[PDB]
Amino acid sequence: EVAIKMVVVGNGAVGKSSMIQRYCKGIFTKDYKKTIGVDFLERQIQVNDEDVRLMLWDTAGQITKAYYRGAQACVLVFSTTDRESFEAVSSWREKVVAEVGDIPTVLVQNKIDLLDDSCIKNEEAEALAKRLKLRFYRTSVKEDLNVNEVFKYLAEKYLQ
Ligand SMILES: Nc1nc2c(ncn2[C@@H]2O[C@H](COP(=O)(O)OP(=O)(O)NP(=O)(O)O)[C@@H](O)[C@H]2O)c(=O)[nH]1
Ligand SMILES: [Mg+2]
């Protein structure tokens, strides 16, 4: 079994904990509880012909070097309804790079079910993905849309 440590970063309330808990535990709740300390969740999946255990590290976005240390893949998350979270993506990217260098990374626009309150045009999100040279997924944790694919992509990229 191959273990992969993955970090998930982004501004407060973008849905980092919701993403991780949906992926690992299959649930979603509407109430916002800011993450306390660092929470460790895991999921065992199959990639090709190999058992893989994804070790997902969760912490609040509003961070110690120990959180990033040894990270092998990274999700950069912003929220459909939070322009500041989108503007902060580059800052989060550079924070991760400064800690661990070049690791497989993916850009995620979460809360896509709230498109009526969107603060980011589709073309702006895609322009950011291109400028950062990152694969881009639109997710809804509430609807369980594309969450599995985000983590599968990172696991496949690490193993390749
Ligand atoms: N409509 C909708 N709400 C979502 C979605 N994902 C998360 N939320 C909501 O957004 C709020 C914040 O989610 P949470 O996962 O705690 O965010 P976080 O990035 O972990 N925050 P923190 O950095 O403070 O720990 C919660 O009210 C949660 O229900 C989504 O895809 N759609
Ligand atoms: Mg959280």
Author numbering: 7 to 68, 74 to 171
Paper text:
It plays crucial roles in Hedgehog signaling, ciliary transport, and embryonic development. As a member of the Rab GTPase family, Rab23 acts as a molecular switch by cycling between the GDP-bound inactivated (OFF) state and the GTP-bound activated (ON) state. The structures of the hRab23 in complex with GDP or GMPPNP revealed a typical small GTPase fold of the Ras and Rab family proteins, containing six β-strands and five α-helices.
To elucidate the conformational changes of hRab23 when switching between the ON and OFF state, we determined, by X-ray crystallography, a structure of hRab237-172 (residues 7–172) in complex with GDP, representing the OFF state, and two structures of hRab237-172 in complex with GMPPNP, representing the ON state. In the presence of GMPPNP, the main chain NH of Gly67 in the switch II loop interacts with an O of the γ-phosphate of GMPPNP through a hydrogen bond. This interaction leads to the switch II loop being pulled closer to the GMPPNP ligand, potentially leading to a change in the conformation of switch II, including the loss of a turn in the α2-helix within switch II. Nevertheless, the loops of switch II in both the GMPPNP-bound hRab237-172 structures are still partially disordered (residues 69–73 for the one in space group P31 2 1 and residues 68–73 for the one in space group P2 21 21). The switch I loop adopts a closed conformation in the structure of hRab237-172-GMPPNP (ON state). Residues Tyr38 and Thr41 from switch I differed significantly in terms of their positions in the ON state relative to the OFF state. In the ON state, the side chain hydroxyl of Tyr38 from switch I formed a hydrogen bond with the γ-phosphate of GMPPNP while the side chain of Thr41 chelated Mg2+ trans to the β-phosphate.
